[model samples]
Every structure is written in structure tokens, then in C-alpha cells.
Target chain A: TTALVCDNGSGLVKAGFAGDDAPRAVFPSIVGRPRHQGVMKDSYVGDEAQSKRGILTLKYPIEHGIITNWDDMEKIWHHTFYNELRVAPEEHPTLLTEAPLNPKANREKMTQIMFETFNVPAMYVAIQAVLSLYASGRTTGIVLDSGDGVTHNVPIYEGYALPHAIMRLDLAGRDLTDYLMKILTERGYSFVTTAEREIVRDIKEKLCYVALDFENEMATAASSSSLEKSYELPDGQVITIGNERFRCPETLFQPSFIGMESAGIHETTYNSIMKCDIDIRKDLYANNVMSGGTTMYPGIADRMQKEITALAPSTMKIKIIAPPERKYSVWIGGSILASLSTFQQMWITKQEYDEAGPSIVHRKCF
Target chain B: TTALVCDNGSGLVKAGFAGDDAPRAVFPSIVGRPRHKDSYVGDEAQSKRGILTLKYPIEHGIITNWDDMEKIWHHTFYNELRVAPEEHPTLLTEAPLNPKANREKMTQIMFETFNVPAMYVAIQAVLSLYASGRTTGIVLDSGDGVTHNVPIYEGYALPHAIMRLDLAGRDLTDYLMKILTERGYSFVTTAEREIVRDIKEKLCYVALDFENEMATAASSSSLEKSYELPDGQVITIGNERFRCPETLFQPSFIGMESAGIHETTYNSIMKCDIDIRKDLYANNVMSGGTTMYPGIADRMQKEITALAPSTMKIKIIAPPERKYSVWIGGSILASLSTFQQMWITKQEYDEAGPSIVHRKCF
Candidate 1:
């Protein structure tokens, strides 16, 4: 049977056929509302939505890393299949990735939507952390996943997430963007258009890197102009970044800088390990796998490994494995899991859903 | 079998027999480190005559000093509880997010030092939730050093969703002292501090409508109350009553950069699964000594209700005895035959050493 794999991320939706090396389509997880036209419906879905000029309102399908707006998500899901992948849903088995410990109802709703609405033959909902583990070719490890809205320290033992030991931080990529915007505004930079705001994000992506020693970097930055680099804006203005480059990503390491009383990524990792069973602590520490878009910053992998290494026990060997295609790692894991021969029996067929109802997914998949 | 329940709180330590209605002993959690002589522990420590310095062995529910902890636990079990440590099984209540090393150390102490036959460690938030007679809920505990918002599902706490803040009873009291000092009331002695605390307990109440209460305080002096000092000076307190306790609701007023109790409570619940949000709200429970302030439950209910979605059914349950909720829950849990099977035995600890605790317990 043909299989379709999709990762419903907060910023983007990565979707493709199982066994594919990369996703066939990637688009915003948003629906755009038409401004001056009555011919079209209230909203347009998928990639074209972002390119459409004078869009009135942007409706995001996900809120706080959960799919709350099911109606819009349905449209987007259909768009992923027909408009983007050009595949008929009724002929294929489908596998979708879910956030760790996702609400029981969201999964039931997703199962219902897939079989009843899209008419998929069979389906399986996989945990994102487990998928991340599969993507790394390891059945057990700690997954430090930072998406747009949430950063999670998830430990996987024998291909299952230990829900008790998982740690979540409200700080993630969105906070970094907001922090960068704040720094730019304070430095006399302004973006008149929404597209220009996207330019600031690009500038941040191109320039920012995590500092090994923030205090030393700041001190050196005060006396050194060599670290300063100018980014040309779309409007022909140049924005120079000196200390702000490292300072923006510094919040992930020092959460107290953002007024949150929670531990930073390094401490969170140590704490997550400390909460687990003693026998597995060293394995988790040695096989630390990093994922998500935020982990893509130039020096983030080395910086995280260094900081976590310092806090961890001296005997503990701290190894951080960051995949090259950081953003698509979760989707890639979904692809690999879907393609597995052992996963053939794991699918909750549409007939099973029809006979036993939505509750069957919980029993069958979990 | 006879069981001992010990609730190690930041402000106080509560210990009693399993079937008892109330704790046999309740005292401050501090241990006095003396310049000369042996270190004083528990109630006697607070009453010592020498120039003894106060040190807390357990800070924010984590055991920091093993020496002080050993002394405190010994005194609590022998002097206060009046029970033979070797004869009874112990059920200890731990605060949420307690470090792993602390738990292992505690297990070692129980098996080796106290020589107890069996032991079980229960999370304070889960016990607080269980105390209300529900297996699942959101527990908001505001104690001495911190306020914790923990979500429990099917008798287990979701560690990832747990949120904590440094703003709690100590912050409130410190702010109250500052406000009183600004109002011409000087507190120099320990006795004066207790008097001020007594005034706070008697006069302070959480405001349902902060803006309306402030306006009323600005215009009227009818709510003013006078407290007699140790020196016989009458100190009148008016607006300071509401202003002092208001810091718990709006932490920004006292220069705390963190979010207030209501926001943190909401955030913690939001971090959980959406399907269980309503269940958590309906079973929303508040515990801890600081929540004993008058109108705290009412104000918290109103504030949380205002922030919740319209479709949600918000019900905030505050048990009458908020201070002893953890102990009562332990008392109930320890008496159950179902929970009895979960305890780690002395034989098991002996076979596996301290590391056995992490595997057998969690």
C-alpha cells in the first residue's frame, strides 16, 4: 500500500510519500483571508495563500503547537494531498506525527478526519520524539526538540517516550524572533510591511550564532567593532549587528534574561536526565539528539553540547547529534517509520475505526 | 502495619501516624547551626537561647544539607512523632520537580539511618490532587519559597507541564513589611516581626476587584484597623492590607518580573492536552498555607474564570484545611491496600542499593 507522511508543524507543514528522501511540498500552516474580492471564499489555503497580495486576515490552523482550528486544518490537509502532492487519499495509508503527550481528543479528532473525510485506507499516529529517534536510526535517546512555539526535552526508552521525565519550555524560535525584533527596534530599525518583518527574520537567520561565553563575548564586543556586520534591507537601508547577533540566541541558554523563572536548555537537559531511571541516565546523556528549526543556528549544537557537558557528571559522556536537515528531521523520521516492514500491522484501518469507533486508535496505536 | 506520613514543607514539617486525623507534630522546617554546642533541630531549634544562626536544610522541598536533614528527621521521628522508626513503614510526601539525587539520598537515609521496614515517596501535588478525592486535576500550591502549578492525570503528575514561580508567602510577607515600614511602623525585633505577621493574618484579604478596592481605599478610611505593638504603640493600618496581599495577584506591583499566580496557573493547564483541560478546570484545586488568606479562593476563582474560555466549566475547589491537605492525602493513601503493594521494602533497598529507589518508586 502507498503511504503518505505529514508533519503538521506550527510554522510549516512538511508532507510527502513514505520512503522519499525529502518532503515533496512545504507550505505555511495558515489560511489567508481575501481582502477586496468577493468571488473567492473567506480564505485560501496552502502556498498561494502567502503570495496573495492584500490578504485581509491570516488564520493559523495550529495554536500553541496544537491543532485547534480543525475546519481550516481540514482544508489545508486536502490542499497538501490534491494541490501539492497530487495524490488521491482513498488509495493510500497515512501516517501523521503528533506532539508528545498530545491531548487524547486531538488524536481522536485527527483519526476521524482522516478516515471519514479524506477516506484513507489505514492510518497510524506516531509520537514526534519517537519519529525523531527513528530518523536518527536509534531506538532510544533523549530528543531535545525546539519548534516554533515549544522546546521539549523528551526521553525515548525502547521506542516510547517516558512522559514522566519529559520537560517543556515555553521559550522557542518565536521568542527568539520577538527578541530580535525588539533589539532591532531599539536600534532604530523599522519594518513598514509584514514582508519586511520576514526580511528581519532572514537577517537573524543569516547573522545570529550562540556564544560559548556570553559575558566574555559582550565584553569583547564593547571594545571590538570587527564583529559588526551590516545587512542590507529590502528598502535599501543597512542594519548593522554587533552584540545583538549573539544576544538574541542567548535567551535559550539563560532563560532568566527573558524574565522566566525556568531553567535554560542546558539545565533542562540535565534535569530531564536526573528524573529518569538511573540505569538509563548515561545512555540518554551519551545519545542526546537535537532537532527543530531553532537548533539550526550556527554554533547552537557546539554551545549546547559544551554547556550540558559542564553541568553533567564528569563520568557522563555528553554527545549531541544534530542532523543536517534540522527542520525536516521529524518528517524524515515519520517517513522512515512509515516505510518500516514491522509497521505494516500497526496501521489502524478505516474498517477498524468504523467497527470499534475512534476509541480504537488509542488501544491499537498506543 | 503502622505507617508514618511526613510532609516536608518549605515553611513547616508535618508528621503523624497513618490513621490519625491530624499531625502529631507541626513545626518550622529550619535547623539552627550554633557557633558552639550541637546543632538544634525542629521546634527546639527555634527556641534556643544562644546566638544560633538559622539554616534551612531543605530549601524549596529539596534536601540541601544531609547533616541537618538527618538531625531534623531524627528529631521529627523520635522526639515529636514518638514512634519507633524501625517498627513502622514511612510514606514521605515530596514536592514536585524534586531532584533525583535528593530522592536517592532520602531512600538511603530511610533504609540505613531510620531502619524502616518499608518506604514510599509521593509527589506533594499528586497527593494534594488526591486529597480532594479525584485522581486527576490541576493543583496550585503556594507555599513559603515558591508557588507550583502541577497537572495530574490518572494519579501521575505531568512533569513537563509543571510551572513554578519564586513569588509566594515569603515575597508577600516581605512586601507587607516594606509597606508597613513606609507607613511609619518600624519592626526591629523578632517579636515585632511576629506581631506584624499576626496583623497580616488578621487583616489581609484578597480583593475580587483590585481597581474597585483601590478606589475605595483611596476615598474611605472606614476599613482602617489599629494593631497594638509590643511597646504599647497603636499602629493604624488601612490601604496597606489590600496592597500587601495584592502582590500575589499582580507580582509586577512588587517588582517581581515573573507572571502572577493566575497567569501561571492558566499557562500550566494550557500546556497539557486540550481534551483534559475541562476536567482539570472542574477539578481545579488550591492547597498550601499561604492560600489560607481570607477571600483567596474567591478571588482566585473569579480571576481564573475570567481568563478561561467561555465554553469551559471553571470550578476552583479549596479544601477548608489547605495547610494540611498533603498530610491528609498521605494519611488516606497510606491506609489503602491498593497503594500498599507499591511501597519499596527494606529487603528490596538492601538488594539493589539506593539506585533501586528510582526504578522501584517512579
Candidate 2:
């Protein structure tokens, strides 16, 4: 039976294949209220969690991508993951998406809860990226999975073969959207507050661009000559582009302008590329591809191609693989991983997991 | 023999003769300090004015020229003009050295002061020109008798006839000394301010051709070169040769600079010559005689001959006058008009003066 995954910001859950949908779930790690009492009346989750006043915004379900606060996480996990999904003993093997490099302790806690609380027969855990490749069945390319909050890039290889690899600075689609807000305010139109600085982040999906001489392009775009750069605000106010004033959120190419004391994108990418076994370096270069929400900018591919071409040997060929449905990569991968027979080896059995509990789960019992 | 003419910021006074010399002298008109009663302090005069802590700088008086408070003014006149010169039956006069217009109220004051000067209204050189009857000559000037030139036309000319141009001895004194000190060596090499100034006057006489001086002294006296001093401070100064401060002091003259006072004098004289309605002008032009010069009537006649038009067949005659224009003219008239013809009768002054002093003098 196909597992219907309706993942929200709360704990991960599996939708039941049977008539009852909820199977099992885990609580998203969140500090509900302030340590000081009565700071907030109630707390909401995911999107709603944000609107509550005096509530602290937490980054992940676990501490730095690991499970913590087991009790609250378990309750939320029970309600959303299992109750909503209605998954029962009849459904054992399940597919779940998780953050990369999750802590061993958090995974252990998850396994204990899955087997002990819901008494699952078996559970198959797969990385969102590992499943994404299976879903699309593209041996080589990129899987750019994005959600309400962040955009992650996972470059894939031919059936898990050799490839170039790297992680970027925290710069993301969020950064580009911020630059839009900055240019707006600097032009004397401050309609947003500091708290809402990131309010129009999704606006990047609609308007942000990776420009060529971005400021000049913005200028030409904003100038009366070209009608390319007008963006409307929520209050129906519009700003036109002119004379190189476009929001260049791509300053990560030269973060020093923003007073960041670090190497720029090229150097960071080059250094990251150099760390791979020297023999694989060529393959990594040949296989270099970008996948992220930021790629939506019109000239993003061109910018990356140009940067890579310049940094790499002038003779090297560069390519950008843009899929029509960029975000479906991870979902496809999850489906494929579930279809694999050997993928069953990665799952933990309910009996074995319950007996030893969270510790045994950490040892990879299946 | 003469009256001493003194002036302060506000007014001028001509003290009548004391035996043989002009008798009058005092500080500028300004009353500065007042008596601090009960504080062991006495009322002070000009000396105590503008002092360190309690500077009641003069507002009016003999020193201040009498423009401010009248009490001090009246007192100043009483102390200085009224008695200091001893009222020796003087014919004292003030501001005759100035604009003729300055004489009116001033003359009234003098008449009121003592009623005793042998004559009045004869202080500064305005009377000199008046007595000479030479009617027109630029004042070869200096001193605060306002350093101006008067074109004397007639013995009693209208206000317009007295034309005053600017330039005075004070200007030269200040300019030359300033240039010397700024050039650095004078005080160090010469020591005395007076001597340095005298030398500046004697040696630093106006250079008729200044650019030639600059060129001739080019190597030896460039602006960058210093006049090394005995005090070890070297001053680098140059560039001023014939540049007269007067060029700026009055600018109407179209320049080949260095104020052509001589030319201006000649030009003004020519203008006045045509305006004088007389064959006296013809006689004055022919004999080269001007009735004005003291002891130099003949020389003035020759100087005029050198300047006047040869045509007019006019005889420019130098009248043989030695103070004749004033004294002889006065005597000639006086013999004709004796005491019986005098404006003031002896009875009038004797009866009116002492008791009704103020009204009688007026």
C-alpha cells in the first residue's frame, strides 16, 4: 500500500494505507512558551506557530537537527503523525523525510517511539535525497527540495556514483527576498517592520532575479526606458527599477561588500570541491549542478555557469539541468526507496526496537 | 604771535596767544570716569578714562570733542578753553583749519567762552588760506585738520569753494613704519622707532619709478630673500616700491599711479582760473602772481607763468606782498573804518560783558 505523506512542520508522520490513515508520528522540537510563566496563552505549530506573540521561534524538531524534549515531541508525534495518518499494525514499512546528519540519539528516540508506542512491525527510514532520486529515476542531476521555511540543494549521481559535493553558506532564497525589501526601504518606502523583514520571502519566487551587473540591470530595468522592473507592494504601491539599483542578493559572490569576513562563493565552492579525493575531482566538476529555490531567478543558471566556467579551467564545459517540477525530486525519491526490496534492510522491527527501546534503535536494529 | 589749535574727537578749540605763543592744549574730548563717593576715590578726568578694571571711557569733554554729555562738556570748556589759556584778550578761533562750515556754532562757542581773545576763529590753517586771499591752492597737508585740500577761491568763499582731498602726514607715518617693521630689520638694526621712521622718510622717499627699482634690485632684493635681523628673525618682504596707499585712499584718478597731486592741483587751478570773474585772473596769469603765497609772492608768480596760457596777453603780476594780503589789507581797511565804524562800540562790551556774561558774549 502507498504511504501518503502529509509532512508539516510538526513531527514526521506516515499516512495509513488502510482506511484509517494515521500510523505514527514524532513531535517537532519546539519551546512552547517562555521559561517565564504565562508569557503566551497558547502555541500553534508550523505556520500558525509563528503568529503567536512572545513565542520563541525554534529552528528544528531537535537541537541542531536532532531530537530533544522527548515528551512534548512524542505527544505531537502521536496526534499528527499517527492520528492524522491513521496508520496501524497492518502498515509496518514506512517512508519518512528527515534532515541530513540527524543525531544518533534523536533517531534512537524516534525508533523507540515508533516500535514501542504504535507497535509497528517494521520501519524503513530513508533520507529525503536518497528517495528523491528513486522517485524521478534520473541517475544524474540535482534535487532541490524546498518547504515553507528553507530551500536545500542535494546534487545526485548516477545510481550513487562519483560526483562533486559541497554545502553553501546559510545564504538562500530568503536572502534574495531580503534584498528586495532592502532596496524598497532605501528608496524611502519603508512599509515593513524589522519583525516582518522576512515577510515577503515568497516574493522572491515571483520577482527576484540573478542579474548580470545586477545594479546596472536594475537601473536599466528601473529607468523609464525599460518597463521591466516594477514590483507592486501588498498595499498596491509599486516601485520601478532604474539604473543598477536592483537587489543583488547574490552578494554571496562577494560577501565582503556586506562586511562579511569570509571567502566568497567561488572560493568556498572551489575549496569544497578540492576536499574530495583528487581522482574524483574531475568527475565532480563534470557533474556539477545546482538545485535550489534560488535557481528560479531568470539568469541564475547563466550566473552559475559563468562563475563555474571562469573558476574552472576555461576549457571545461558547464551545464545547468532545470527540471520542470523542481521540488518533486525528494518526494519521488521517497517513493522509489519504498519500492526497493533491499531498502527493507534499513528498517527497524517493532519487537526488536521495543525490547531494547531507543538504544537498540540507535544500533540500527531492523 | 599765534594761537594753538587743539582738537579732540568731538570739537576743536583755538586758544588765543599767551604773550608770544599760541595757548591751548589738552587731551581729546571724552569724559571717562566719575567720582566713586564714600570709597576714598576722587572724581577723575581724561587720565582715569578707559583704565584697566573700571574703564569709564570718555563720552565727551575737551578730550572727547564735546559730542556727548554736556555737563562734562561745559566743565571742560570752563577749565580749558575759558581759563587755561587765561582768556588773554585773544582773538582765538578753532576749526578754521577745517571746513568753513565748522566755524558757525564753533565761533558762537568761542565768543561765549571768554570774550577776550584779540581775535577769534583763527585756529587751524583755514584762517591761513582765508588771510592770504590766494583763494585757490591744494593744502600741502597732514595732521587731523582732516588731511584735506581746500580750493580757496575768495577771501570768503562759498562752502563749495573749499574742496578737501584726502592724504595726511599720519598716513605716511603709519604706512612707512608698518612696511619697515614687517620687512623685519628696522627695530633690530636701528633700535629707535622715531629714528627708523625718520630714516624711512629720508631714505625711503617716494620712488618715482618703482618698477625700475624692482628690476634693478631683482637679484639682491627678491621677495623670498630675507632682511636678516640682529634678533635672528629674518623677514622675507618685498614688492612695494611706489605703491602709494593714497591710490586706494582715493580712486577717481585714472592712473599712471602715484597720485599726481601736482597734476590734480594744476588741473583744479585751471578750472578755478576760468571761474574767477576778473581781469585779475588775467593779471594773475600774466605776471604769474598768485596773491596767496607767504613771502613767496614773486616765486608764485613765476610758477604760475610756467603753468598759464601764453595767450590772453594777460599780465600775471606778483604783488609785492609779505603777509600783505592779510595784514596790509587789514590795515588799509582799518584806517578807513576806525572805532566809530567798528561793529562793537566800547560801551557795548564794557556794559554788557562781565555780569550778563553769557548773553553779552552771544
Candidate 3:
């Protein structure tokens, strides 16, 4: 009776019934290969994989932020369908999100995997960036998406990403983690186990803020008692972090701090807009939307608005829309798109794939 | 009476007078500015905390900014070596396959700015090959910015067969830094990079069997080690100790799209004349700071040896003296009495101009 919407994200896959406001099931993007002699199943996916205590070989089907390993991918999808949501795929139309610059071959492989492996009735593939825009309740905008592995800036005008106007940088959640790690190492901090990375990430997401005046904030943090905060690791060791709170996220603005040779986020956004036609530049600026897990950081919206405002031309008004808790923003957009009556024509049916093969998704979508 | 040998490299500039066994001063190939107006040069800039707007004049062994270039050159001459540029006849090393215009520009700078009486330019890859005391070999140089796989037949470098990638010491250091960060550590200063590199050199090793090592890392207690930071915070690392350096052999492990060093080394030799391919395989030479990692030679030999046909004798020779091979070669070449006529005199330059040096030297 209901359609299914899923976001195959790098950090976690979000899945739920269509027309719902948020994802009902979310889990880490990993699969666990069990021991040979174990009496249990051969593999474990998502929460089950992360929850098991003993040492297990973890397989990441997604590499470079894309699904590349089909076998592990099948397990993840199976877990998402049966164990998490208990949805029968053959009876529901499903909508999935794809990377902005996904290759044709990858799309075809994904289509083959989706229909043949899962036997979904019908499906529509939407660009993740466009889905984020749709989640923001806009059909046209400049989308700034920063996720676990990669950050991209794409200008979407009327539900289509401008291929020529697309720009990507290697800065994202991992870069932030590296920045925080560097700060801790410099201050003589270390963890007892590898799992402390989760604690480190939690500390970063909770404490760090995007500074409006980075230099001033850095100077003040050193002397201000209010700025200093203490956090206990899993081992019960307490460490104080002050300037590090802003310095970690500051790499999002100045990537050179992490040794990457690229412009900062706002400057990259400006560069993406400049690649587009002059007529749409103003609209793109006004309708700027921020999505992805990294953009959920505290004060990120205000900082982006400030920086983008300063860099944008005075004639143009810069406005930034950031949805609260962007974990399911892409999934929400996929759900919204699938619910539209106009979107019925956009579905790449199983017959089309059977007749024209996997390449049909490329021509049918985008 | 001593001629200076300067290798204006991507990450660090190695310079000293000829006839010396080693370089007197080696500094980072970058200039930095303090919060105020004054700028710091090379090592001084690198060591200084809170330095702003750090700039690299040379990228991939080619000078992009003459102003920053002038600062680094002056610093290497004045501050580090404590020598007057005009007092010494300098011998500089340029990258192979360098553009003619770049050489001419450098030649003009040497004569006009430094006002040196005489100068000579040699190819960096050729110098590395020459340092090993061999005329024919496959030269693999992994510096800070780029890794170059070049083949040399006799004394001449086979330029068309050269293979290059944007992977080297910096990429490795960055990858290591990322892994450490994921383990709940952080480093803030430019000097902190040296700590990471030191850790990399001391603790990291290439895996003879990657998957086996990973499995060992999962269960073996020996895989874990504790390192005390300069500030006395002891951090424990496991798994990453091997995974960091492993990226040099498997670039895709870090999501890099380029071919690994071992693959490119084999391919570079294969693309050359088949008659000389066996010779290239037997005489594979490794050079530069990045190649100094433990077990690199063994790993490279294992991979390349496995790939080459059974008929050929595959060997990888990486000298412990490789870190200074380019500078040492320049010293070895500059000190030779037979190389005196090769120097471009200032008088010849006044007559024929910058373009003339290319023809007279090469």
C-alpha cells in the first residue's frame, strides 16, 4: 500500500515508507563477515554488525563514497528491506538517491542490482543534491552538500543539476575528524581503543561551531573560561577542548589547514555559481540550500550565510536554507518526489530494463 | 673555490658547496609570513608557529612565482649556507622534461639576480641515476609533490617512457595524519608534520602480505604500540601502523585513482625499447625521502619481480644514501675536472643571452 524511500549514504543508509516525514531505520554502512565456525548466519549488516563485540572482518561495499561491491551491497539492501522495515519491495514503488556525478555504468549496475536482486516493482533514481533541494521545498537552488567522504557544490535550476556548474572538494566529515585529531595529538591526547573515534566524532558534532570571525574566536578561546569544555572518553579520561572546537570546523572554510589545495566552501560555492549562465546566478544565490550530515554542525548555516554573503555580488541577495537535522533530508526529498503524480512518468520500469538493458536508467533519469 | 650545488626540489631545497660529501643545509621549499608584515624563509618559516599564508614557490619541481622563488633562493644562500651567491659558481639541478622557457627563465635569474660568474644545470633524474654510479637504470624518485618513474639508457634519460603521479611524501603524510586523526589525535602547527613523518619512518613498514598483516593486526597483541608525543601525551596505535605506509603500494586504499609505485615502475620499463627492458628491470633504482620507508624496496621487488617475465632478472636497489642522492650527484659531477668546460660563463651569457645556455649545456 505504501512506496519505499531510501538514501544510500556513505555513513549510514536511511530508509522508510514513502509520505513519512523521516526515515524509520538508520544504520552504519558496513557488513560484518562472520567467523568460519560460528553457528550463526554467514554475515551481519548495519546495527548488528556494529553491535557485535568480538573481532570481525568489516567489509565496506561503498568505497570512495559510492556502492562498488555488489555482494556486500545485496546484503545491506536485504537487511534494510526485511530486518529493518519489513517492507515487501515487489509490491511498492521505490525511490533511491544517487551521487551527483555517478557514472553511467554504476547506474546500470545499480539498476540491475535493484530489480534483479530485490525484485522491486518500479523505481525512480534521483540525484542526491536535487533531493536535498526538494527537501528544502525548492525546485531550483544552489546545493552545498558535505557528507562523510566528499563535499560537492551543484547548481540545480528547475530540478536538474548543471553538470558544467558542478564543483567538488575533498573536504567533509573525515577532514573535520582529521582536524580534531591533529588538535588532540598536539595537546598530548590519545585514546585507549580505536572505537574512541566515535567518541571524538560525537565530541566534534556536539561542541564545535563555525566561527564568524575565526581569528578573533581563536584568540578569545585561549583566554576565556567560558569557552573551555571537558569531555570524558570511553575509558573515563577527561580532556579539555577550547579553541579546538572552532579550529576543527574551520577547515571547512580554509581547507589548506588540512593540506588540501582547494578553495574554501564559500569560495567553492562562488566558483560553482560563476560557471553557470549569468541569468540564473541571482536565483541560485537567493535560493542557496545546505544539506548533508556535515552541514548539520552548529552555527554552520550562519557562517555560510555570512561568508557567502560577503563573497556574493552586492547586487544579489544571498539567502541560505538549512533544514533541521539533515540526516533524512535526501530521503524526505525522495519520498516527496515519489508521491508526486507528475513523477509517475519518470519511473524506469522493469520491462524497460529487460528490453533496453541497464542503460535505460541513464536516458530515463536526469 | 668551491661551487655550490642546489636542488630546488618540491618539498625541500638541498644545497651545499661541491666537493662536500653531504648537503650543509636542507630546508622546506616554502616561505611563510608572520601575523605582522615581515616574512620568514624556508626552515625558519616552517618552524615558526602561527605563521600565516604559507606559500610554495615551486610545485612539482617548477617555479611558479619568481618573488617567492627569490626569497627561498636568497634564504638558502644567505641564511642556511652563509655564502655569498656572487662568490660561488653555482651548479643547480632541474627536473627532466623541463620546458625550454623554464630553463631559460631560471638561467636569466641565476645570472641577473645572483650575478654568479658561472652556472651549470643537470637533470634531476639523471643526477639520481648518476649518484648510484650507474649510467643505465630505471630511476624511481618519490619527492614531496610528485613520484616520477624514469628509465635511463647509458647516460641519456628516456623521456618518452617517464611515468608521473601526484602521489608522494605529502600524500603519505596526509593519509597518515588522517588515520591518526581518526584514532582521536590532532596536530596544529606546520612543524607537526615532521612529527608525523618521524613516526612514519620509525614505526611504519610495508606489508609483505597485506591481507595477512591486516588479519594479524586484528588479533595479534604485537600490532599495538605506544608513542609519546613531544608534549608527553602517549598515544597507542594499532592497524594504522601498517595501513598508513601501505598506501604507497596500494594507492586505491586511500581512494587515490592513480596506479601504485610498483605498478608504474613496471609499466615505465615496459613502455621502453624491449631490447633494454631486462637491463632496466635488473637495475631498478629507488631515490628520494618517500622511498626511504622500511620494507619499500622489498615490497617493490616482490611486486615488480612477480610481474616481469620469468626470463628476466628483476631486482630493486634502494641505497640508504638515497635521501641526498640528487645533491650528492651534483657534487660528484661539479667536482669533476672534465665538467669545467660545461659551465655557462657570464661572458657567454652577455653575448648569446638566456636561450644560448640551453643549446650550450644540453
Q: What is the lDDT of residue B200 in candidate 1?
A: 78
How is the predicted docking of candidate 2 categorized under the CAPRI scheme?
A: incorrect
Tens-place lDDT digits, model 2, residues A3-107: 433232222223333122122332333435434444434334433344553544433453322355675565545555544555554365544455545566666
Which stretch of 10 consecutive residues in model 3 chain B shows the poorest summed lDDT?
A: B353-362
DockQ, candidate no. 1: 0.01
Per-residue lDDT, model 2, residue B126, is 35
Q: Tens digits of per-residue lDDT for model 2 on B74-95?
A: 4444555555433333332232
Going through the candidates in order, what is chain B's TM-score?
A: 0.95, 0.47, 0.94
- What digit string (tens of lDDT, one per residue) describes model 1 on residues B1-362? 68999998777889999888778899888889776548887667767736688888877777888888888889889889888899899988787898877888899999999999999888888888888888889998988777899998766687889988777776777778888888786765666667777877788888888888888888888768878876788778888888877888788878878888888889999999887898988888999877778888889888888899977888889899777898888988899755565677886666546654443222
Better of 1 and 2 by TM-score: 1
**Best of the two (1, 2) by lDDT:** 1
What would the TM-scores of all predictions be? 0.51, 0.40, 0.49
List native contact recovery per candidate, as a fraction of 1. 0.00, 0.00, 0.00
Could you tell me the TM-score of chain A in candidate 1? 0.92
lDDT of 1 by residue, A63-134 (tens): 656898898899889998998889999899999988876897898899999999999999988888788878
lDDT of 3 by residue, A84-137 (tens): 999777877778878878887788788888899888877877899988888888
Interface RMSD of each: 17.5, 69.0, 29.9
lDDT of 3 at B300: 87
Worst 10 residues of 3 chain A by lDDT: A357-366
Candidate 3: residue A179 lDDT (0-100): 73
